[PDB]
Design an enzyme around this catalytic site. Structure first.
Site, short mmCIF file in Angstrom:
data_model
loop_
_atom_site.label_atom_id
_atom_site.label_comp_id
_atom_site.label_asym_id
_atom_site.label_seq_id
_atom_site.Cartn_x
_atom_site.Cartn_y
_atom_site.Cartn_z
N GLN A 19 4.11 2.70 -0.57
CA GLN A 19 4.74 1.76 0.38
C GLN A 19 4.74 0.33 -0.09
O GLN A 19 5.17 -0.59 0.61
CB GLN A 19 3.94 1.95 1.65
CG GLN A 19 2.53 1.39 1.41
CD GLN A 19 1.72 1.77 2.63
OE1 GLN A 19 1.48 2.97 3.05
NE2 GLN A 19 1.33 0.76 3.39
N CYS A 25 3.20 2.33 6.61
CA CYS A 25 2.56 3.64 6.49
C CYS A 25 3.07 4.54 7.64
O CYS A 25 3.30 5.72 7.50
CB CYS A 25 1.02 3.55 6.51
SG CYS A 25 0.41 2.59 7.95
N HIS A 159 -4.38 3.49 9.61
CA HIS A 159 -3.47 3.94 8.50
C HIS A 159 -2.85 5.33 8.82
O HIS A 159 -3.58 6.22 9.25
CB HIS A 159 -4.28 3.98 7.18
CG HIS A 159 -3.43 4.30 5.92
ND1 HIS A 159 -2.28 3.70 5.51
CD2 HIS A 159 -3.67 5.29 5.00
CE1 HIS A 159 -1.82 4.29 4.32
NE2 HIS A 159 -2.68 5.32 3.97
N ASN A 175 -0.86 10.80 0.85
CA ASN A 175 -0.89 9.36 1.16
C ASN A 175 0.31 8.61 0.58
O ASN A 175 1.00 9.30 -0.23
CB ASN A 175 -2.14 8.78 0.49
CG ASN A 175 -2.59 7.48 1.15
OD1 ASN A 175 -1.92 6.80 2.04
ND2 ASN A 175 -3.69 6.94 0.62
#
EC number: 3.4.22.2
Length: 212
Positions: A19, A25, A159, A175
């Site tokens: 990102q 996120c 997150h 992730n």
């Protein structure tokens, strides 16, 4: 449900993204679930736009953070373009959806996993990838290089990430920090510890798109 689930061995997960600097996120997490459900229903694996949620979800705060559940409602009411049509900029611009033509996909709503419930999370993951949150601010999380991560970390979830599998001892997380983090972008977080928060708060708030 089986002892191991990994949606990558079913072809329902796209490459690891990065990102950047932008607190996007929540947008990253949401699009993982949407690429997932559309594969599962149509048999095709597509990349969808995190930058269109960035610009267009009103509810969320652009690069300052936001909500995978607001994003996933936006896709339920309106839809979402493909990633190559509305590419990632890693800055909030204004909503360009109306310019980019008709949506590439629309989903039929959003459900919540019952929070604080490892089994209800495992059963949702055995069905399709799921948007999850966790506490990432800790150094031990940031420095993670591979293995089954057990913390330390708290539960000041900060997150959003996507659960795409599990095993006997872990949940497998995609992730949005690129492939040099973790296991080629992935983390295996320990499960079955009996902390109803889950490790680093993993059980706090999980949502998935519904597509008929």
């Amino acid at each position: 449900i089986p002892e191991y689930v990994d949606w990558r061995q079913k072809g329902a997960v796209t490459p690891v993204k990065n990102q950047g600097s932008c607190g996007s996120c929540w947008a990253f997490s949401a699009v993982v679930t949407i690429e997932g459900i559309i594969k599962i229903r149509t048999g095709n694996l597509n990349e969808y736009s995190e930058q269109e949620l960035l610009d267009c979800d009103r509810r969320s705060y652009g690069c300052n953070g936001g909500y995978p559940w607001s994003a996933l409602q936006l896709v339920a009411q309106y839809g979402i373009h493909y990633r190559n049509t509305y590419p990632y900029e890693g800055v909030q611009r204004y909503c360009r959806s109306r310019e980019k033509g008709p949506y590439a996909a629309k989903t039929d709503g959003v459900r919540q996993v019952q929070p604080y419930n490892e089994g209800a999370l495992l059963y949702s993951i055995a069905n399709q990838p799921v948007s999850v949150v966790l506490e990432a601010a800790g150094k031990d999380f940031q420095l993670y290089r591979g293995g089954i991560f057990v913390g330390p970390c708290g539960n000041k979830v900060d997150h959003a990430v996507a659960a795409v599998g599990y095993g006997p001892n872990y949940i497998l997380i995609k992730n949005s920090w690129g492939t040099g983090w973790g296991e080629n972008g992935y983390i295996r977080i320990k499960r079955g510890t009996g902390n109803s928060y889950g490790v680093c708060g993993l059980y706090t708030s999980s949502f998935y798109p519904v597509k008929n």
